[PDB]
Design an enzyme around this catalytic site. Structure first.
Site, PDB file in Angstrom:
ATOM      1  N   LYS A  70       5.837   2.739  12.172  1.00  0.00           N
ATOM      2  CA  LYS A  70       5.040   1.557  13.158  1.00  0.00           C
ATOM      3  C   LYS A  70       3.987   0.897  12.346  1.00  0.00           C
ATOM      4  CE  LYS A  70       8.398   2.737  15.754  1.00  0.00           C
ATOM      5  NZ  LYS A  70       9.563   1.733  15.862  1.00  0.00           N
ATOM      6  N   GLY A  72       3.218  -2.286   9.882  1.00  0.00           N
ATOM      7  CA  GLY A  72       3.922  -3.368   9.466  1.00  0.00           C
ATOM      8  C   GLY A  72       4.040  -3.087   7.798  1.00  0.00           C
ATOM      9  N   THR A  74       6.243  -5.773   6.196  1.00  0.00           N
ATOM     10  CA  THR A  74       6.797  -6.981   5.843  1.00  0.00           C
ATOM     11  C   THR A  74       6.470  -7.429   4.494  1.00  0.00           C
ATOM     12  OG1 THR A  74       7.210  -7.521   8.166  1.00  0.00           O
ATOM     13  CG2 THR A  74       7.540  -9.311   6.653  1.00  0.00           C
ATOM     14  N   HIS A 135      10.408   6.706   5.614  1.00  0.00           N
ATOM     15  CA  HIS A 135       8.995   7.456   5.975  1.00  0.00           C
ATOM     16  C   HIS A 135       9.105   8.881   5.716  1.00  0.00           C
ATOM     17  CE1 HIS A 135       9.089   4.157   9.476  1.00  0.00           C
ATOM     18  NE2 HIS A 135       8.668   3.504   8.178  1.00  0.00           N
ATOM     19  N   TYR A 216      -3.371   0.878   1.286  1.00  0.00           N
ATOM     20  CA  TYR A 216      -3.215  -0.530   1.858  1.00  0.00           C
ATOM     21  C   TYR A 216      -4.282  -1.314   1.751  1.00  0.00           C
ATOM     22  CZ  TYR A 216      -0.820  -4.160   4.436  1.00  0.00           C
ATOM     23  OH  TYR A 216      -0.271  -5.388   5.195  1.00  0.00           O
TER      24      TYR A 216
END
Length: 284
Positions: A70, A72, A74, A135, A216
């Site tokens: 869940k 993001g 993109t 995942h 990230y």
């Protein structure tokens, strides 16, 4: 309680006894979660993992992005797609770029998701090099992936963001304080979170030509540096700084701090410190 009847009947009959035998807990996002190879899953994801493990045939030229449930993806899917394809679909012909023609989630398909909903999907009819997303745990990847010389990039979000993503998703569809406690115990969708992360962290140090570990937070803060690092892992040649800048620019059309009270953030931090000692992955 017994599992739901979801998807292709033939696959339902192939997996239902196995699923019915696993440990189960009360779900938040869902009625029941089920423990499979050390991690808790929704029924849909578990059916897709089971099929994926049986059916997926890796290629040595594959690139698999591993992300958390869940979050993001993109932007990450776009950056890596654009990097890998920078001569097949030049970043410059922009309007004709697949990232603009089509959705990054169709270009870089979620493996377990595809297997859940389309079990007979022929992944070999996609062009190589195949970029795909999952995942699945390092220890639960299909055996052909484990044995291949394909490339794996693990994109790690802070566990507090991992929780909030799951929370924001479920509340969209039981108080936050209780969900944080379950997340910290590990008996929660996609958990335990520390195992999902640590297995890839270990692989990135033990087999650095197979697994690359990207935070990230660094991909966001120092995108050009992190992309050059990914390129060097994925490919053998030189990449110019300007090629990387134009990739980032193409993809530019595509936190927990706002959602978690400080006491919940600290609660997660207590589990992080305990579980990640002295790994030494540290979070900021």
């Amino acid at each position: 309680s017994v599992p739901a009847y979801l998807g292709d009947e033939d696959l339902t009959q192939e997996t239902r006894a196995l699923i019915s035998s696993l440990p189960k807990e009360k779900g938040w996002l869902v009625s029941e979660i089920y423990e499979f190879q050390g991690l808790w899953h929704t029924q849909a994801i578990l059916q897709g993992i089971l099929i994926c493990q049986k059916r997926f045939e890796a290629k040595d030229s594959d690139i698999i992005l591993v992300t958390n449930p869940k979050s993001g993806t993109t932007w990450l899917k776009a950056l890596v797609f654009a990097l890998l394809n920078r001569h097949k679909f030049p970043v410059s012909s922009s309007g004709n770029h697949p990232l603009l023609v089509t959705n990054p989630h169709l270009l870089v398909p979620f493996l377990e998701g595809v297997y859940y909903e389309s079990p007979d999907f022929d992944f070999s009819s996609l062009p190589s090099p195949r970029l795909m997303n999952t995942h699945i745990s390092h220890l639960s990847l299909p055996e052909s992936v484990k044995s291949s010389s394909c490339k794996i990039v693990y994109c790690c979000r802070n566990p507090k963001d991992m929780f909030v993503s799951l929370w924001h998703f479920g509340k969209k569809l039981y108080p936050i304080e209780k969900a944080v406690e379950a997340f910290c115990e590990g008996k929660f969708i996609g958990g335990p979170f520390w195992d999902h992360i640590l297995e890839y962290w270990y692989a990135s140090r033990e087999n650095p030509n197979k697994v690359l570990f990207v935070t990230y937070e660094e991909l966001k803060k120092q995108t050009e540096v992190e992309m050059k690092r990914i390129a060097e892992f994925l490919e053998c040649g030189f990449i110019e700084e300007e090629e990387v800048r134009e990739i980032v620019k193409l993809c530019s059309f595509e936190g927990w701090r706002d959602t978690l009270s400080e006491s919940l953030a600290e609660e997660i931090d207590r589990t992080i410190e305990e579980k990640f000692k002295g790994s030494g992955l540290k979070f900021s």
